[PDB]
Design a protein around this ligand. Structure first.
Ligand SMILES: [Cl-]
Ligand SMILES: [Cl-]
Ligand SMILES: [Cl-]
Ligand SMILES: [Cl-]
Ligand SMILES: [Zn+2]
Ligand SMILES: [Zn+2]
Ligand SMILES: [Zn+2]
Ligand SMILES: [Zn+2]
Lengths: 225, 225, 225, 225
């Protein structure tokens, strides 16, 4: 595609103009992320989302837009009675989703594809508190420059990054980075996980800028809770 | 825009190719109508949709695609705490939405726009049974040829066309005719209304072809029930 | 206990004074049956009630109060993660429970006890329609005298008496006959099943009288739907 | 009635035998308080409980069992479309209700009666934190002897003791003190409010003992959340 970023002429408000592939960024009515609030959410009988992850990390990469751990694709979650395989997880500071108009300092996205290429993203909010042992396995080898990949020595257990309480918000949205494709199932856990001040600072300094897309209009959607 | 229809080179499967304005018909992942079934629906605490219609019909038109009653825009429903004003209502045979993979013989759409142009459509299924007195007010002056408009003499009470039980399915979808714009709130009443064999036959003969868009993939969406 | 019936000083309105063990039947605040209506019901995320019945019927008995099929106690239903074993099932005409104040012609009750003696009743409504083959297995050998037991010449499959759709109403209730004991789990299925008019007529004649207790005050309860 | 307390032959475990009017306190199947946990709670479309209190406090009383503020009965809450009038409110340390088996340091009860004598209690949990100004209005004039009543020198606004978020748990329950009467509507608010450690300490010292009844068997009930 074409070069995109978070500020200036290539920032989020301009993404739809940068490449024909990115049209959804501007024409889409079901875009992500969103604000999750009292007026837009509705109590619903949402199925438990069961997690069956494995330790098949390949590497960690700094791609200039995030820090991402690329997985082998063997582990999966179950959504809508189907297996969605974990391909990668990556991070944003501050959070992309907001709750009652407020950001969390950090948000992790676990990106899954089913047999037919349909996408489900699990979102986990982080608050500052105790050091996160699982996050540290990745952080201790975080690539400091864009384009760098590092082989991970410790075994990665992505399940340990999820909250203990697995209650979630669900809505139909989009990828939050170009091409901002729609038909994406979002599963955003209600309970935040903790990370240390130091862990958050390390990520923010390595990135050097906020890498969150602004929240998008809910339009016709309800968020299920 | 450009000429579209329900068969041949201008049929629904081709709409997205007929005009630049119609791109959503083919790129959209949140399209209407849909099948409403057990696997795609979820029990939700949906707000009552209150109806405050008035008798401000202007005329009935056969536009070659449907029979439509154009309203003045004074009456409204309340959805998401906002007034959506009734602009027009019109009809499809067989139904556009299906339930458990099955059509109803007929479906009415009541099209509403809020202050900012956002669209809400209320859908009402009809089954064959007793003659519908309210429908007859329109049917007795139904324009038989495309492009014809008739002034309505009887006072139209669109509320009398809704089911007595106002429980509904809700989802985020699209217009079912070009340009198939998304961000449309759908409110599809669960209980069907009755019309006579004769009323259904009259509509179908005047139209001369089935004017339903095929059901579209649910993709990331849940239907709320 | 004591003695009881459906008319006069032994009818439902009097049961409560006929014994100190027939107490709850006046001091009780959680009695059955009830009217199930819009005002008293709340949409709730009710777990599916799974049914695992076996053909262990022992005998069919006319005990003067109903026509009853006594089971071996091996089949069971799962409610609140616990197994409740089918001890017996029996019949009422007209229905004991009402929906929106209206009776069904006929109601079947399936009575279950867990390991610790706790009771669950499943209720099934019947409407007049096509002859019920499973019911006919019992009808063709229906006993006619208070105290008379008869042997079943056919294999009884009680699950075949249940509706195909297993959605249900639930509340904390009572036995509908003295000692009108409380703490009964009630699972009343929404979809009625069909029996012949001839089938209904036979039960009503053999019974000779209406064997349904009038509906009881809901009090502090909600019905879950 | 009779006589009761929180230790020995007058403690909660014995109340049930101390009078024939203290009966339900052993034969009852619907008692309070209860543990509110994942297994016993079901997501449900609960109506908002609207609160319309007025400042009609008459006196604060130490009746040996609690510290109680008696109200004129003019303020009310709306439950099931009916008005339930605030007669009195009072306090427990530690909390009577538990959430997932864990006590809060403190619980407030607000006791309401409708026109026909039916009871609703609203429950509010307190955690240790910043000093509670509304609570302090009552504390600064707290009476210290069983039977002692004192006059309030400040205007009492009981609604200021409620959490800002009014989401709640609901069940069909009992009084938590003899005659432990059933058919009580329980509305227990989810969000706790803050009091000072000094505030908690005073109540605990003035009381001298734990005045919370142990949690009771859920039986056939579900808690709605
Ligand atoms: Cl779901
Ligand atoms: Cl809603
Ligand atoms: Cl349940
Ligand atoms: Cl409610
Ligand atoms: Zn992301
Ligand atoms: Zn239409
Ligand atoms: Zn029965
Ligand atoms: Zn209390």
């Amino acid at each position: 595609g074409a070069h995109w970023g978070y500020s200036g002429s290539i920032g989020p408000e301009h993404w739809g103009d940068l490449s024909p592939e990115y049209l959804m960024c501007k024409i889409g009515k079901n875009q992500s992320p969103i604000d999750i609030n009292s007026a837009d959410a509705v109590k619903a009988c949402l199925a438990p989302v069961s997690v069956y992850y494995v330790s098949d990390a390949k590497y960690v990469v700094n791609n200039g837009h995030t820090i991402k751990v690329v997985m082998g694709g063997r582990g999966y979650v179950v959504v809508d009675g189907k297996r969605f395989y974990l391909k990668q997880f990556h991070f944003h500071a501050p959070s992309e989703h907001t709750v009652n108009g407020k950001h969390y300092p950090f948000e992790a996205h676990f990106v899954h594809l089913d047999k037919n290429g349909n996408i489900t993203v699990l979102g986990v909010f982080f608050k500052v508190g105790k050091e996160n042992p699982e996050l540290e396995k990745v952080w201790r080898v975080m690539p400091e420059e864009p384009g760098q990949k590092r082989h991970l020595t410790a075994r990665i257990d992505p399940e340990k990054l999820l909250p203990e309480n697995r209650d979630y918000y669900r809505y139909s949205g989009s990828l939050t980075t170009p091409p901002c494709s729609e038909g994406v199932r979002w599963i955003v856990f209600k309970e935040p996980v903790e990370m240390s001040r130091e862990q958050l600072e390390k990520f923010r300094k390595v990135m050097g800028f906020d890498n969150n897309r602004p929240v998008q209009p809910l339009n016709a959607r309800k968020v299920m809770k």
